[PDB]
């Protein structure tokens, strides 16, 4: 049925059945023994699911390569698979992605027998991308095709934002792109703006349901792509109002742990580039592959391990969770037991920023916790100290936590904060001197005045 003119023209790939092999995907066999292209038929269609066929030997790779030239408009394309593996042992699904026709790189490699599951991948930028699923029935080499039970079933393939493809499903639109901050809505009939302090998601176009309000202690960016942190948090207490400042923490810092030897003599140490707030929500802390040049991920906190170099870059701060002094925020907590109790004793502040990427090791995803502290003796603009118990900070598996200490982190004291030492009227003389008793900045110290009694 023809897509209505109201909805935007959307083309997507969906192959729930395999009675006819799609022209985009082609089959090829790479022999495991000789590592050469056999030119065989790696995968045989069964009408409902595609499985690996038996070649010269079970060790041979069964390649099914699907190539798309471009993407029709950093999650421009979210490809989803449904892989069901009846394989017995030595079961590898080398799902490789070729960015801009580069050398194939396996983003995810499942091991062992697994059930049907959905896996999503992110295409950072538009380019020619080929999805190749390589299967090896057995890692060990044995003579004869004695293992044909190891077959991988992929009966569903979904591709989003594809160029030159069929329109399997059409998404709705009002059809011009609404300005940033306005949620696209077809039933309304006009570009309608989201409420203030809310961020809109482009994955779900219709309605304001995808438009989500910002978290505590945050401000909305003009683009509404992600929330922005004002760097000044104000909370109410019975005594007075506490205004914790973090303006000086906008700049990035370079803190790395001590090198650690591997099982062999190789040594490594983790280095994180942290940008707490500021820059109008721009998370420019990026880690690149300088060693490759002889990619880059944009996040407030950047993860990279460098040997005595630039490898394993993954984003740590993609989505803002919340900002407040409470330990818990949207079900995310920091390991406060590792952080030593601060000397000042004021309630500690913690910042939360969760990364969007989800891996096999991190089923719940990568959530980053940043603990904020204030210390009067820290005369330096900022002293970021790694937790002693977890030098690498990866002991939690998904929560990476550092400790920052600076003078500016103390709350902005009110007027009544400074200690009063006014002298009373005896012998015709009185003195009024005011000085601080945890205060940060604020009005200068008032001078003394003399008056007759």
């Amino acid at each position: 049925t023809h897509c209505p003119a109201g909805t935007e023209p959307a083309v997507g790939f969906e192959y729930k059945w395999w009675n006819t092999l799609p022209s985009n995907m082609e089959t090829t066999v790479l022999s495991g023994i000789n590592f050469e292209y056999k030119g065989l038929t790696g995968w045989e269609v069964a009408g409902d699911h595609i499985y690996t066929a038996v070649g010269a030997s079970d060790n041979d790779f069964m390649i099914l390569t699907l190539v798309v030239p471009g993407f029709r408009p950093k999650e421009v394309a979210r490809i989803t698979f449904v892989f069901e593996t009846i394989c017995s042992v030595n079961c590898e699904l080398y799902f490789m992605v070729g960015m801009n026709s580069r050398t194939n790189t396996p983003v995810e490699t499942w091991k062992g027998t697994k059930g049907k599951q959905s896996y999503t991948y992110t295409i950072e930028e538009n380019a020619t991308v080929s999805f190749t699923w390589a299967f090896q029935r057995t890692t060990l080499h044995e003579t004869g095709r004695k293992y044909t039970n190891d077959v991988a079933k992929i009966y569903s393939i979904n591709v989003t934002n594809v160029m030159g493809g069929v329109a399997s499903y059409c998404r709705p639109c009002a059809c011009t792109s609404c300005p940033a901050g306005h949620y696209i809505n077809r039933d309304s009939g006009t570009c309608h703006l989201c409420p203030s302090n809310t961020i809109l998601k482009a994955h779900q176009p219709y309605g304001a349901q995808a438009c989500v309000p910002c978290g505590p202690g945050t401000k909305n960016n003009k683009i509404h792509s992600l929330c922005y942190n004002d760097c000044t948090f104000s909370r109410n207490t019975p005594s007075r109002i506490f205004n914790y400042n973090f303006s000086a923490l906008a700049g990035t810092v370079s803190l790395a742990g001590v090198p650690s030897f591997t099982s062999k003599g190789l040594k490594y140490f983790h280095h994180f580039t942290l940008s707490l707030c500021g820059n109008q929500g721009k998370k420019m802390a990026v880690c690149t592959d300088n060693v490759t040049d002889l990619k880059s991920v944009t996040a407030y906190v950047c993860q990279v391990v460098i040997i005595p170099v630039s490898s394993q870059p993954v984003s740590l701060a993609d989505r803002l969770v919340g900002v407040s002094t409470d330990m818990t925020l949207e079900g995310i907590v920091s390991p406060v037991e590792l952080f030593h109790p601060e000397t000042s004793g004021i309630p500690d502040i913690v910042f939360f920023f969760r990364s969007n990427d989800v891996t096999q090791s991190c089923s719940s995803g990568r959530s980053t916790t940043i603990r904020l502290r204030c210390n009067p003796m820290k005369a330096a603009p900022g002293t970021l100290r790694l937790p002693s118990m977890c030098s690498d900070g990866t002991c939690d598996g998904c929560n990476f936590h550092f400790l920052w200490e600076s003078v500016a982190a103390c709350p902005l004291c009110s007027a009544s904060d400074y200690h009063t030492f006014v002298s009373s009227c005896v012998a015709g003389i009185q003195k009024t001197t005011y000085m601080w008793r945890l205060c940060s900045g604020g009005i200068s110290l008032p001078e003394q005045r003399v008056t007759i009694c």
Binding site: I33, N34, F35, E36, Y37, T103, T262, K264, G265, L266
Partner: protein, 96 residues
């Protein structure tokens, strides 16, 4: 051929192994050097086929010359085995 393997700073058990029709590099983190000392009586070249599956392990092929005097890194290979060749002089060139 001298299959010298040394730790970069035990991996002594990890070195370039004669897997079969092809030799195989060590997967773990160590420096496995395959060196050949051949005295070329005439100017010539070397032609060897090298498979570069992944960028995790780097490949270096430099022929040090007669005086021990020393683009060394080999680019990744996709699809086929690919082909490599460099020029050699009349000196006692030692391939590594």
């Amino acid at each position: 051929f001298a299959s010298l393997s040394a730790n970069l700073e035990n991996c002594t058990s990890s070195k370039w192994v004669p897997r079969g029709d092809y030799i195989a590099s060590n997967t773990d983190e160590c420096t496995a050097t395959l060196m050949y000392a051949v005295n070329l009586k005439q100017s010539g070249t070397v032609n060897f086929e090298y498979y570069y599956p992944d960028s995790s392990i780097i490949f270096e092929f430099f022929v040090q010359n007669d005086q021990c005097q020393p683009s060394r890194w080999m680019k990744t290979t996709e699809k086929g085995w690919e082909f490599h060749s460099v020029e050699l002089n009349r000196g006692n060139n030692v391939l590594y």
